[PDB]
Symmetry: C3
Subunit: 216 residues, 3 copies
């Protein structure tokens, strides 16, 4: 027996719950296991879109040895804090993908990714901890994505790009391909704004916007 | 018995007819009902892409009590005029979606929407009359879309956005999310240009272009 | 009996091989025919992502009268040179599409196209030799695409656009629709940059970037 959850019942979670149901009901063929929301804003349990929603204290109290959680909180500092709590409490991180999520050859993705509908992860990609790939995003050939990276919808991450930990890539941003000799790097904790057209390396902690991308 | 139609046999209609066939043949499981084009440019009936095409006078003359029409005319002033005519003539407005159109939880969409392939309508969205969501568009969580709104392909409408009646959002435009306390408003009859990167409220009747969006 | 290949084992080929397997195993229902990579960088055969990879000399030497090749090299000058070699050696050019590639009514596409996942080719489109439509691209109604045209991912080619031979359209570029009286032309060998917002005719051999597009 198993219990599943989506951690976060705000916009991120409510748009991922249908995806977690595709993952569980169709890709895993599991019509038996319950799935709930976890949200620490809750005191008493409520329902959100027809699913039971409870705080983490209550979720921990459930008498099941086999818990699986997708963290659906876009802020990567919160996501890392929750992931470390879950692992310490002996709860499994759970990767979810949609029926229309395309995974190509020789792809490695660490546990706990949220891979939305219409996402492509192309050939020979490596992805670290609790990746968020929102609707329509792609990661093309030979990319290396670090830990707690977050893509908004419709990110175009071309080939030979290395995105370091905790970077955020905004809606519809486009990133030029690197080369095998010079991968294009997005630095640790960088923020690439909605619609940015990135043609060069982004420094760690930089915020870049515009076409072409410039420091904000 | 029933008769279906796509109103408009120009580019909008010809790219929606396959979608109307997915809706009718697959999602409704109806291999019996006829589907035609209506276009008022026609005097004599013709064929368009292998479908009978006739003017509205001829469509009205068909002896069937049960007519269903998708209005495939992007201009929302024309669309409203035709919708009001159809309803007055006792003809039903007909929502169409593709096999790859994704509808999430607690979504309300008024009759007569054209929801293209690869469209996502995410959690807790409300949409008014004869919405057009062209190919690849999305409407994310908690949005409220009014009546006779029109999206070009690949619109990224993020969460907590309120788009008022008759707005037009151009190809690949990106709109920043609102918050629950302050939804980002696109005003009545506003035009958001192809590729616009919208980070603030757009006034009613404004035309905005660019990255970032500015008045044209 | 038949032998298939993807010509190019670099990023283009490695992200198309899964698509060629969808085309062959599912759309053609062929679980018998072998598929390999061809790459002229190879001296001795190797494996790439679990597929045999050989140079063209070795592929020619295979004793099969019935060879089918998808050219997965984005550079259109190389693609034309290889296509002419294949045809002269009595090898067939092979169109590939994905399970999520949508083709609408009255579409004509010459042999050897690479039509990626999530691509739409809309109504009444004509496409010439060895077209590349990378992930998420669309070609809308009434377009005429010439020979050896190349789209990066997420190109938005709206209706009534004529793209002449060897043009390249970069990631996420958006092109305004033409009209029936005045198709919007992208000239021979033009380059439209990543993220460009094209609102006017692009001259032959021009390089255009930005929002709005300007000469680079
Ligand atoms: Cl897309």
């Amino acid at each position: 027996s198993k219990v599943f959850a989506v951690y976060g019942a705000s916009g991120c979670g409510r748009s991922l719950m249908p995806v977690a149901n595709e993952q569980l009901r169709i890709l895993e063929g599991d019509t038996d296991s319950q799935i709930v929301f976890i949200d620490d804003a809750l005191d008493d349990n409520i329902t959100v879109n027809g699913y039971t929603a409870m705080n983490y204290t209550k979720f921990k109290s459930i008498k099941n040895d086999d818990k699986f959680v997708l963290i659906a909180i876009a802020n990567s500092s919160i996501r890392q804090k929750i992931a470390d709590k879950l692992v310490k409490d002996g709860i499994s991180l759970w990767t979810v993908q949609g029926m229309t999520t395309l995974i190509m050859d020789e792809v490695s993705i660490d546990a706990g990714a949220a891979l939305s509908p219409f996402v492509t992860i192309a050939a020979n990609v490596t992805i670290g901890k609790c990746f968020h790939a929102n609707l329509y995003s792609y990661v093309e050939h030979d990319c290396i994505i670090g830990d707690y990276v977050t893509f908004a919808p419709r990110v175009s991450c071309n080939g030979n790009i290395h995105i370091h930990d905790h970077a955020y890539i905004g809606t519809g941003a486009v990133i030029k391909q690197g080369t095998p000799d010079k991968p294009l790097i997005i630095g640790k904790g960088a923020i690439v704004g909605m619609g940015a057209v990135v043609t060069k390396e982004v420094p760690a902690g930089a915020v870049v916007i515009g076409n072409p991308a410039r420091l904000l």
